[PDB]
Design a protein around this ligand. Structure first.
Ligand SMILES: [Cl-]
Length: 252
């Protein structure tokens, strides 16, 4: 078998560190002047082809952010590996939530967790898994032993298929109804139509430009409809969720 993997996360999350740990020395060529970094390894007969997305804080349409946002929607991947810095979860997991809305196979890799044990803060990864609805693993991206064990675990997961349960993240009645009017427009695409509709409601360039004139005017009309500023409602919903989540999964 061949498996294709994307590594994604915030700058200095350690996604580059994990990328490097898993690949050793391997290739580099462009996405445009922006450089595209690719590497491989072999484990248990199977080959692994990895692409590293530039570091981003959010999937917004800013050229590095553009590339990454494009790539999580359209680039082939058997799995997305979201590397997360554990020492600032409220910020890090924002993108995680966006990634979960896509409903593409993914894993969340919690980095920097020995830094967190300093503070005498522990995380319940069982519950965090229950919240996110994807695999969550603890892994220091900078020790090669744990990265190597991670190779076997990744191989396992890819082999049996990654079980995911859809993230229960609700935007309130008015926004849900707007999402609902628009999903058909985005049905039977390579990604969840709900995420595409959310992207469109956010006036995402990437999604919106794929549309014909009529349906563009339908999206823009739904934007106009919404009483609350959208970018702000999406943030309150999301950061409220991470506060909920963080208050369940943390203990000092
Ligand atoms: Cl899902």
């Amino acid at each position: 078998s061949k498996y294709q993997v994307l590594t994604v996360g915030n700058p200095n999350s350690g996604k580059t560190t994990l990328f490097n740990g898993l690949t050793g020395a391997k290739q580099q060529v462009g996405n445009v002047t922006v450089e595209k970094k690719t590497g491989s390894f072999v484990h248990a007969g199977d080959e692994f082809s990895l692409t590293d997305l530039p570091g981003i804080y959010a999937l917004d349409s800013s050229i590095d952010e553009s590339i990454a946002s494009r790539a999580v929607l359209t680039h082939p991947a058997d799995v997305i590996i979201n590397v997360v810095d554990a020492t600032c979860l409220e910020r890090s997991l924002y993108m995680t939530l966006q990634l979960r809305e896509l409903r593409r196979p993914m894993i969340v890799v919690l980095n920097k967790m020995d830094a967190l044990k300093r503070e005498r803060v522990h995380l319940d990864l069982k519950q965090l898994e229950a919240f996110l609805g994807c695999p969550v693993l603890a892994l220091s991206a900078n020790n090669k032993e744990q990265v190597r064990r991670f190779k076997e675990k990744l191989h396992k997961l890819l082999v049996q298929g990654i079980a995911l349960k859809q993230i229960e993240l609700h935007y309130g009645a008015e926004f849900e109804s707007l999402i609902h009017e628009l999903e058909p427009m985005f049905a039977e695409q390579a990604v969840s139509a709900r995420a595409l509709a959310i992207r469109a409601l956010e006036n995402d360039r990437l999604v919106i430009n794929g549309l014909k004139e009529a349906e563009r005017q339908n999206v823009e009309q739904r934007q106009h409809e919404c009483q609350v500023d959208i970018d702000l409602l999406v943030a309150n919903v999301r950061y409220t969720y991470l506060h909920e989540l963080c208050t369940h999964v943390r203990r000092t």
